[PDB]
Swiss-Prot record, chains A, B:
Binds 1 [4Fe-4S] cluster per subunit. Belongs to the quinolinate synthase family. Type 2 subfamily. [4Fe-4S] cluster binds at residues 170, 254. Its main location: cytoplasm. GO terms for molecular function: 4 iron, 4 sulfur cluster binding; metal ion binding; quinolinate synthetase A activity. Its EC number is 2.5.1.72. GO terms for biological process: 'de novo' NAD biosynthetic process from L-aspartate. This is Quinolinate synthase. It comes from Pyrococcus furiosus (strain ATCC 43587 / DSM 3638 / JCM 8422 / Vc1).
């Protein structure tokens, strides 16, 4: 195609004009990798991000890795070409875990909030998690937010893995967000919203009516169809009750996300599009754990 | 050490006597990798397992990968050197997901029951999940049981990822097991057991008393301290209520697991120790999805 070749020509030009370097993950599209200056795994990209002299970094990759590069580059401009379950981990979880196991290091999988990396000793990617967790002196380790990875490491190193957030708790109401609220208005515009008390306080604010499980099965008579911010069972239950209800979230996870294409990279260099920002207070704190991971890996 | 060198000498001898090959994962201990005939990643090991002529395979690796090799080798003996959240996915989940999205392929992360691989089109490892999910013709994909991986793929391919088990549901009571019951007897021997109705029916059988959330906060007067098989909040709640309660599970995940050491490999060749078995009915079905993954990767 001539479209493709013209894009690459524009991308190469904008590189010099913006003074930009382009990093892409190994799982990105070939066309994106082609224009990328560096292509690698999560760790390689993290390490490459400490050695950038360009004023601008285009991070052709997933969000938390883009964020991780910005944390390594506070005085540069980090861009993610496209628009954007890691918000499960709260700082309180780390404090309660450090209270019971005070000599256990806090290890966070790279997919985590910067706010929580600020309370971690070291970060890991999937490929270095076992390597690093073995290396830590303690045989008791605090680890999150990825349960699967936590179980996996547990199984391979045999060490005592204390997961965060702790298991034995239901996190359904926490996985609702302000963006889930707005979607329930642009869509289902003629409808009022039910919100369980245990939801995000930000979510509680835009809540039309606020009811618990019993409050829902009673006040479900002030509209024809509702938008219920709770366990999905309660959608079928109100449905059977009053045949004259839509779940707050769709089945598909992170829908709306578009893969990063050659055009995305072009439009990002040209518009300085989608800039990754982290508060310096939290960034400079969270940065310690990331650099530690580079030291051990 | 001379202990080490004598072990390797015994391992090498037992190799010929049993007619065995030893496979080890890249994240295993160096000493284990040393005696291993083949060392690789999850995919490499899966592929290597279709090309074994030995009568015995020692799988120095995590359980679901050991299981995956047995599925590729029904007529051989597969051994895992040591004693043993994938049981979250049930077949019903796949049927309900295929009902709403009938033209969506069922993709399962390798860490899943064989019983569910029997209802899958293809399996993935972390390193090939994006590669393969992109390759599938459909833009709607059913994917589990690993939410993290599902979100990650969603973000990178932009496709519509329908997770299994579906989100918006609490799975606390399902993550209890018969082994969690037995642990609450060898430990806390002088105590009776509370079990929520929504637990495993196998778990329900060994349940002393069976009560719901309200039934628990009432019948908590027939012992001094209890073992509560429910959400951990209910442990602190009974605690505050009747100061005259222990969670059913410990904080640490998969504790008891021991890393595979040089001795484990020796003791496994010598005792034919810890044999991985999968029912041929289910194995020969589950095998299709694994071989498909090798074809696409
Ligand atoms: Cl990335
Ligand atoms: Cl976009
Ligand atoms: Cl393995
Ligand atoms: Cl063992």
């Amino acid at each position: 195609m001539e479209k493709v070749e013209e894009l690459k020509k524009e991308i190469e030009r904008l590189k010099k004009e913006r003074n930009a370097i382009i990093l892409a993950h190994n799982y990105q599209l070939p066309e994106v990798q082609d224009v990328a200056d560096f292509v690698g795994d999560s760790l390689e990209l993290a390490r490459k991000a400490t050695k950038v002299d360009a004023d601008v970094i285009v991070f052709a990759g997933v969000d938390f890795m883009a964020e991780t590069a910005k944390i390594l580059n506070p005085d540069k401009i980090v861009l993610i070409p496209n628009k954007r379950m890691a918000n499960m981990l709260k700082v309180k979880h780390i404090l309660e875990a450090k209270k019971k196991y005070p000599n256990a290091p806090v290890v966070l999988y790279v997919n985590s909030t910067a706010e929580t990396k600020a309370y971690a000793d070291v970060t890991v990617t999937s490929a270095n998690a076992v390597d690093i967790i073995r290396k830590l002196d303690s045989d008791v380790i605090i680890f999150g937010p990825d349960k699967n990875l936590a179980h996996y490491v547990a199984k391979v190193t045999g060490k005592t893995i204390i997961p965060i957030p702790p298991e034995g708790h239901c996190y359904v109401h926490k996985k609702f967000t302000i963006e889930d609220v707005e979607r329930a208005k642009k869509l289902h515009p003629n409808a009022k919203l039910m919100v369980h008390p245990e939801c995000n306080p930000e979510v509680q604010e835009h809540a039309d009516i606020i009811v618990s499980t019993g409050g829902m099965i009673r006040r479900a008579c002030e509209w024809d169809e509702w938008v219920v911010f709770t366990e999905r069972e309660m959608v079928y239950r109100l449905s059977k009750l009053y045949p004259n209800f839509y779940p707050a979230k769709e089945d598909a996870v992170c829908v709306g996300m578009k893969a990063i294409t050659l055009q995305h990279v072009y439009e990002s260099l040209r518009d300085m599009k989608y800039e990754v920002t982290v508060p310096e207070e939290i960034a400079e704190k969270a940065r310690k754990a990331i650099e530690r991971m580079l030291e051990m890996s």
